[PDB]
Design a protein around this nucleic acid. Sequence first.
RNA 1: CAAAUUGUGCCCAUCGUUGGCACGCGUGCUGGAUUGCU
DNA 2: AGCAATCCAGCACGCGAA
Length: 928
Amino acid sequence: ASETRKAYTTKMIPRSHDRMKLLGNFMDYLMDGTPIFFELWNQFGGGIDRDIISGTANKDKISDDLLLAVNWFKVMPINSKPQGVSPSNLANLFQQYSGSEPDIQAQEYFASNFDTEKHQWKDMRVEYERLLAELQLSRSDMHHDLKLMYKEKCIGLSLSTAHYITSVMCMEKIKAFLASKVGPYYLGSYSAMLENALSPIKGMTTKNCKFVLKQIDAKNDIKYENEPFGKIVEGVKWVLHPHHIGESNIKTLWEDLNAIHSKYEEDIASLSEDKKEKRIKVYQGDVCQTINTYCEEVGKEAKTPLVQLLRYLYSRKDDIAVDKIIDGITFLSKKHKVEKQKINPVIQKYPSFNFGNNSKLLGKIISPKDKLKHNLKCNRNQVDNYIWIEIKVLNTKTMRWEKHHYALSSTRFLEEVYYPATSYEGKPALSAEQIEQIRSAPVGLRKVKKRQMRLEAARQQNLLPRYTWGKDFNINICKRGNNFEVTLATKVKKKKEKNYKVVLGYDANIVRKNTYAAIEAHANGDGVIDYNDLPVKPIESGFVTVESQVRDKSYDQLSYNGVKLLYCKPHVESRRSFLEKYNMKDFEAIADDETSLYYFNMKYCKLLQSSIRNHSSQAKEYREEIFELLRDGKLSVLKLSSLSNLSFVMFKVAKSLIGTYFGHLLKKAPPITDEDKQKADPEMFALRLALEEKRLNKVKSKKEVIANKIVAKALELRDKYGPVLIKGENISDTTKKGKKSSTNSFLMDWLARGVANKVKEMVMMHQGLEFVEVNPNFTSHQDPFVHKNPENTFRARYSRCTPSELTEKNRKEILSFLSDKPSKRPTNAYYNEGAMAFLATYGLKKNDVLGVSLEKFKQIMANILHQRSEDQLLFPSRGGMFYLATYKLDADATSVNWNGKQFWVCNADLVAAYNVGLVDIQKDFKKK
RNA sequence: CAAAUUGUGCCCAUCGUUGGCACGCGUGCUGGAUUGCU
DNA sequence: AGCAATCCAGCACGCGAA
């Protein structure tokens, strides 16, 4: 029985200066009262002590010491009342409190790093005594009241809802103090302030409790018997990480070094004579060169191992073994990581004041039916583009409540649930008058006017479905400055069902046109593959393409990648003519009439970045170009950009260009603060902010649109077959230090988990759908519907191509794959066996195939493709599409007989999507 | 309780043919990544 | 090393009722 919430981010319309100021005063009164509740509950939590929690004592694994520590020892900003405690003196302070010494959990909690510059530990027990003294209440009575609170779940862990706390709760003195500090007791305002004060309290408390649990569990996984070895290895300063020595290649490096050392030792033992020092120096130089070459080789696929660390380890080769060295270094890295995990501070939340109907600040959108009643009782057009919400505002001047009306202007909200049926869908056909009105609106209001008129026409034509209002919408009024941002939240109920019938996987690639693929559960037709025991059938499989209808064409935002420059010729010609004045194969290599516009823009950004690096002293002179390249120009990043990964790469290189521009314009040593660069060129900083906001909007739109396409396909399959299952990838632990910096940057824009969260949220809104995450391990190579049934297949990937388009790089890669060399990667073995199968298919005589004269090889391939009546030839490729699948899983796959199997050349992405599906289908369907 | 001029936005070589399209908002802290000159 | 920013993700609660 799952549920979620929707929100339409309405916009407040000023009703009148007096009413607006009244609402602002009410908001300020509520906001200023929240910190009082925050401090009061800080004191209450500080008051906790043993003999109070020793009642029900209900808790999973939380030790009483950890609970007490969190209840009276928290990290808060330096500038706050409870100041006066240092980290060192935590153990004795806890010992004094409750009369017991710290335990492991409490010691770890106290032994938790934080940011001393901004935050600091706070006693949270002198605050309780301060509350007792200032309000002069007996400690016994306060203890009784707070024990009652805890018995009511009003303090500690797992607090009850704020409204319940306020309703349930020496009460006279507490209420008098609240009245002195906060306004008169009113349930709504008190509940709102208590909620907005407790939120950070309980949130950070639970987060830090689970953080301590994780830290103790991680430390229990630390061996600690390498601690002397850790100190030996550790003997400016930085932590040592496993990637600094080639975590896995260090064993081979040390084996080679041990062999060389054995040779050196046996040669020194014999041939005992002078000049030994020269040979030893020659031995040291050779080992140093070997270490450097090893680091150079290892730095091609990961971070380059540190040369100095390896030299230090090799010098101490007799005092520690290779496995001991690895254990010590991993122990040091793990200890450093565990000891830098900050504890979560407790900052004060900015109140939001959720206005509702049941138990919140009373308020409501009036109704559509009551809106019609109001428009009929009072002469009105009966149709308007605004929503009136009645809010029970507390008058600051006269301390009494009063209901006022305020206007919201969200067209989407009207389109979705508000506008009435007086008389996912499409759009109606407008009349003459409505079209004239749309054409008469100003340029900036044309789109919203068009939407409003289309909605009005839909109402006129009975094309607006009845929306069963229900009146269960929550209003969230947040006052930041002098303006409001009402939201109009709403609940959505799903009642999820487990009896699925389809599995709709999607690979969510980065740069290879993320695709989807569906699989039936109990198919009964021509093709029913018995995977293990469940009859399944490939339903279909296609790419996630979003259609933007230009005047006559239809572009794909996710993959358009820009125009091909065949129509942007004047811009490129002007840029070339201007640049010719100052001194070009690279320029022409990117200016082809088939090159995409965004690729050209990215390459130009990188070229300008390099030039500015070269011409560091004159970075300002190019600033105009940057503007003409990013905002002002018609062919600019802000004016023209798609959602394809190439576009995000272009934006990232633009941000890097701005960064290097600031660095070169502000270099002659105090740090270059953002303020200094802003003052040096406020226009450039404003442009950078504009790019950042544009990219944030760009990424949110991409997540939204991809989620829309996949969820719409899921809905289609549900309409056809039944409850669908998406099974999206669990892209976790990505962007590791072990990977190269370029790889980390490339994976950052993956947005795989963002898309997964968005589609999960959407699926929470549609009945029947559900989204689960499965392990992406080996999902990119398994052959669909045949892997795992007899056993794992793990076939390799190819790339079909004609002989005429064969390149030297392809031949070199193929020959390298043909090289029978031992490799630890299972992918290398898979590609080796695939290449062996390819050779056996046509008998290329690998020994005779690795010769020169690539033209001769092309001629031989053409002869082979002539003997066998085909069109192209396949060849293994590590980054190639066209995975070999046994079934026709594409609908465009080509049947080809490889050996005796009659495979279907599908596309790698579609088979990957299929693999992502049915990974744990048995878990989905139990025999019950 | 009347402003009837804007929810956030997204797409484009010819910004309109009424162009096409999407969307949970906030707050808070915690982990990985973007230049720069030795 | 002789130090300025920001983005991508991860969890904590409001969006109870009777």
